[PDB]
Scaffold this active site. Structure first.
Site, PDB file in Angstrom:
ATOM      1  CE1 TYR B  65      -4.341   0.813  -0.514  1.00 55.08           C
ATOM      2  CE2 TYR B  65      -4.253  -1.532  -0.075  1.00 55.08           C
ATOM      3  CZ  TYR B  65      -4.932  -0.440  -0.593  1.00 55.08           C
ATOM      4  OH  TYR B  65      -6.164  -0.596  -1.175  1.00 55.08           O
ATOM      5  CG  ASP B 220      -6.206  10.664 -24.592  1.00 54.00           C
ATOM      6  OD1 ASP B 220      -5.258   9.864 -24.593  1.00 54.00           O
ATOM      7  OD2 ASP B 220      -7.311  10.358 -24.161  1.00 54.00           O
ATOM      8  CB  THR B 246      -3.057   4.468 -22.951  1.00 52.22           C
ATOM      9  OG1 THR B 246      -3.405   3.271 -22.274  1.00 52.22           O
ATOM     10  CG2 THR B 246      -2.482   4.270 -24.348  1.00 52.22           C
ATOM     11  NE  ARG B 255      -5.151  -4.269 -21.913  1.00 52.91           N
ATOM     12  CZ  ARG B 255      -5.598  -3.256 -22.673  1.00 52.91           C
ATOM     13  NH1 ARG B 255      -6.131  -2.156 -22.072  1.00 52.91           N
ATOM     14  NH2 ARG B 255      -5.479  -3.396 -23.994  1.00 52.91           N
TER      15      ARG B 255
END
Ligand SMILES: Cc1ncc(COP(=O)(O)O)c(C=O)c1O
Ligand SMILES: Cc1ncc(COP(=O)(O)O)c(C=O)c1O
Lengths: 472, 472
Positions: B65, B220, B246, B255
């Site tokens: 975490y 983008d 991406t 991904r």
């Protein structure tokens, strides 16, 4: 150009191991693995994923675009992805012993917080009212949070949230205040879920409240996913309309999330005498895609599937029972040692320790214990004044339990924690009668303390060294 | 525990391999790998990640975490995570040759759509106006999409979006329409990014338009991230305030997503003469966390890092040049064969083929070609009558190029595609002057044609089988 040599160099690149390509990262991974091995993990949100799960994340499933859902795809060649996603969904509903005619599940959420946001998008709609537990009282950001100064959580930016609180005496959720307030605020959706609470939720009561206000009851079982699967703590499925969860934490899978939702007759309209049917499936499905997400992370979905399979083994069920046993052991031990446990104890995998009963705060203790290789997280207790000075340490058993630790072991841990607290106290007293957290950290870096810390740290690392670290 | 042995088998489970624990998933992965191997992948958003990247995804980084950012954690013991995140950011700025004093990057986005949503959250704020390319004109859902009935995209649900269009006569974006409409609608943010456009963007002009309306210019570059890295295409970094991307597609990583943002001087205040500074870093950062996301996917960040390192190799730069070469080859071949290519051709990795020049639609062609192991995706061409009958196939080179294919190879592919189209037409004519896409699929599954399709498929598979398939 042609330079076949280079083109091969290129083909070669793509096939060369991690160890050899980008050593920097390879080392980082190994260093982190070592860190995990030698430390004593008491962060309640941590766990160690099985090799099987990690193996699935590393698959070529990474590569495939599968926008949409099995049998309604927007790309071709998803025959195998469809096996996988369907398999995953099927296994999830199995793991929780749910009837497919009364439950559906979406397994595409990228992580927990995406899952919750998706549900609010599907069922609450913009500016819709949500109530969750106030954050300082053991809520999670995604359950709403705003201060007088700013809307902080995206939940509280795009929806209107208001908190319900835990009674600063009992240490329990004050369901009565909730009831009254819910009637004034008119929540569209009420969250039944915590990030730090030692007790089960009165789901049945929450559902009373929700139905009374015409709101949905959405459970966030992220913390107790695994506990509920092994039936070691009440299931939220029995009263909630929707249940969201993380696939990590107690479910011991990779990081991803899932949304369970009711299918079937919601109510019969005696006016029409016919049945009004749950529409949750299309809403939630549409919310996830094409509402919020793009390409599913199939390699993650694979990992989740693998996790779910493990969840249905007897070894898992035992593990969960042990997880709760360990928590009780740890709670009892600290209590005997004079520490205050919020709510008195635990029905689950975590406790909230009010360090005020030792005269210190989690703010300080966290950092010390950290330096002694004892990982926990600070956390405010009911009635905390300043969240810059949290009174509490949130302690949980999942991570260590997955390592093999049993009740006696957890007791030894409680003792190591105690030494940690003693050190904390020492530092604080030299820190001066009301030193800053800043001065505290400086003194901790202080030569005298570094010696004590190294002592304890070594003992701690050697103890942790004795148990295995799942997944390789 | 009571059944020590059972506890011993528990520890065993967590460490025993995928192949042995959960063979079902194991097969699925292998079957998918085989599928990827024998097919010709021309879906423009696909690529094959290097073994190195997949190896990093598999790692125990999953376990930690690390809420927050390096040196603003919410968890202790993030020392190695911090190395990693910072390393990743460093590499990202390198790979894009960005001035670190004038650019920052956050690498936590779970995927692309999360990244964009985060940018709109940070800069646009709810109900703020966004303009992007209309979806049927080559926009992406996340750039806004809403119908007279329903706001479909979450972008369009939580913000007010209106699209700018592609000129149906030229096949180019109609920058003039943009200009005019922007002055009517007053966008807070304008997107410079496409999911299906063969040409470069006038970032240049868009920036005039954005500045003219006091809007942010957000690029983008998801589709062309790799192209931009290798400079095979003009970079959006030079005009846009924020650039989202991406980490797969042409960047050939796992991904995940990333947000680049301007830091430094926004503009001297001639009124004062001092400096108005960019606040993008805190806004975007706060949006991502604790606004929208929870625990970072560290194992994903690792994968991205590995990818970025590969992006800075000369083999990568070569690959990108080849990717564009291949696209041109494929385009030229089809054009020679009389097929109509939207915009005339391509500056990048994809083309949009208007199958109308061969009297058919992408709806049908896609399915045929799919059945012959040729993956592409259907797609409207600018000014298609209806979204229900898309005239277009979107074709891209990244995936196959990463396999090794060069220009001659791509030409052979164009020929295989052609056979696909012929079959499409055959079936369509028997489908008759009418008949649903459903009837078409049924006739396709028909005995007659399944023979022909198996022929073509076999050839196609054997050709593909000859090239390597990245990832081990
Ligand atoms: C224009 C565009 N934006 C965003 C995305 C991101 O989709 P995902 O979240 O599945 O990576 C893609 C792909 C894209 O083509
Ligand atoms: C109650 C609760 N909500 C939400 C989350 C989200 O987890 P993540 O940040 O990995 O999505 C967690 C974990 C959780 O325990």
């Amino acid at each position: 150009q042609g330079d076949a040599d280079l083109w091969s160099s290129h083909d070669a690149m793509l096939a060369q191991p991690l160890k050899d390509s980008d050593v920097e990262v390879y080392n980082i991974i190994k260093k982190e693995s070592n860190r995990q091995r030698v430390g004593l993990e008491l962060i309640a949100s941590e766990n160690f994923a099985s090799r099987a799960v990690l193996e699935a994340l590393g698959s070529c499933l990474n590569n495939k675009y599968s926008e949409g859902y099995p049998g309604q795809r927007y790309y071709g060649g998803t025959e195998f992805i469809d096996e996988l996603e369907t398999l995953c969904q099927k296994r999830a509903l199995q793991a929780y012993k749910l009837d497919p005619q009364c439950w559906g599940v979406n397994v595409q959420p990228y992580s927990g917080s995406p899952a919750n946001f998706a549900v609010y998008t599907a069922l609450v709609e913009p500016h819709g009212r949500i109530m969750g537990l106030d954050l300082p009282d053991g809520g999670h950001l995604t359950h709403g949070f705003m201060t007088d100064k700013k809307k902080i959580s995206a939940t509280s930016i795009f929806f209107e949230s208001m908190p319900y609180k835990v009674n600063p005496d009992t240490g329990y959720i004050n369901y009565d205040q909730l009831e009254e307030n819910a009637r004034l605020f008119h929540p569209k959706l009420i969250i039944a879920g915590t990030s730090c609470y030692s007790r089960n939720l009165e789901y049945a009561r929450l559902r009373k409240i929700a139905d009374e206000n015409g709101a949905y009851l959405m459970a966030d079982m992220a913390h107790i996913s695994g506990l509920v699967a092994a039936g070691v703590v009440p299931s939220p499925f029995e009263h909630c309309h929707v249940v969201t969860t993380t696939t990590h934490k107690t479910l011991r899978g990779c990081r991803a999330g899932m949304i369970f939702y009711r299918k079937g007759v919601k109510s019969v309209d005696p006016a029409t005498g016919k049945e009004i049917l749950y529409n949750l499936e299309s809403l939630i499905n549409s919310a996830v895609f094409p509402g919020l997400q793009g390409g599913p992370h199939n390699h993650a979905i694979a990992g989740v599937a693998v996790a779910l399979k493990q969840a249905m083994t007897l070894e898992f069920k035992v593990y969960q029972h042990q997880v709760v046993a360990n928590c009780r052991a740890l709670s009892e031990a600290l209590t005997e040692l004079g520490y205050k446990i919020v709510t008195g104890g635990s029905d689950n995998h975590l406790i909230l320790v009010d360090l005020r009963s030792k005269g210190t705060d989690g703010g300080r203790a966290e950092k010390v214990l950290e330096a002694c290789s004892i990982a926990c997280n600070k956390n405010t207790c009911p009635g905390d004044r300043s969240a810059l000075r949290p009174s509490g340490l949130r302690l949980g058993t999942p991570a260590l339990t997955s390592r093999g630790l049993l009740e006696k072991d957890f007791q030894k841990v409680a003792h190591f924690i105690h030494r940690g607290i003693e050190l904390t106290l020492q530092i604080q007293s030299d820190t001066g009668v009301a030193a800053t957290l800043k001065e505290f950290k400086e003194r901790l870096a202080g030569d005298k303390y570094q010696a004590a810390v190294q002592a304890l740290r070594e003992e701690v690392e050697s103890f942790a060294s004795l148990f295995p670290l799942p997944g390789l």
